[PDB]
Amino acid sequence: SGAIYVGNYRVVNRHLATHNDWANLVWEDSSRDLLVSSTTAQGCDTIARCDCQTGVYYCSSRRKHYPVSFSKPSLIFVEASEYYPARYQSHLMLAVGHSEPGDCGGILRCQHGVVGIVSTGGNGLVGFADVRDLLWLDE
Ligand SMILES: CSc1ccccc1CN1C[C@@H](C(N)=O)CCC1=O
Ligand SMILES: [Zn+2]
Numbered sequence: 001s002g003a004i005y006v007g008n009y010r011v012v013n014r015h016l017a018t019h020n021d022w023a024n025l026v027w028e029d030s031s032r033d034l035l036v037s038s039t040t041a042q043g044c045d046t047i048a049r050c051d052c053q054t055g056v057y058y059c060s061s062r063r064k065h066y067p068v069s070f071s072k073p074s075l076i077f078v079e080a081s082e083y084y085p086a087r088y089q090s091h092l093m094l095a096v097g098h099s100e101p102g103d104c105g106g107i108l109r110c111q112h113g114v115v116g117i118v119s120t121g122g123n124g125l126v127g128f129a130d131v132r133d134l135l136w137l138d139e
Pocket of ligand 1: 033084101102121
């Protein structure tokens, strides 16, 4: 689990969104596995606005942060799960690293801020849903 809190927004994995996230829906994209909902309290996370390909992510299945090299956002084929059938997920970045389903929501960060959140894994790979293109999260 895990969320990004920026301004009056809350960014989560779409498959993990609650009834409250859906009742206060701002934007959602099934092909990206993202959902943004509105919050009353002001969040103070900083979103990165860059093209970095190195950063650090939090892996709850190991209680550790890991430094990783990751690919640029792209259309990557993702095997079926109980939340989605086999499909292409867009704006997805892969790294060599450990990732389990319960790890979804762990933040990936570079020196500029939050890059994205854990969304996929398996075969020794970890996939992050990118958030750097969502410029409206800051306004
Ligand atoms: C070993 S499978 C795995 C591992 C880490 C993280 C996620 C998975 C599989 N997964 C993919 C998500 C997606 N974005 O389509 C939806 C929920 C889910 O459990
Ligand atoms: Zn950066």
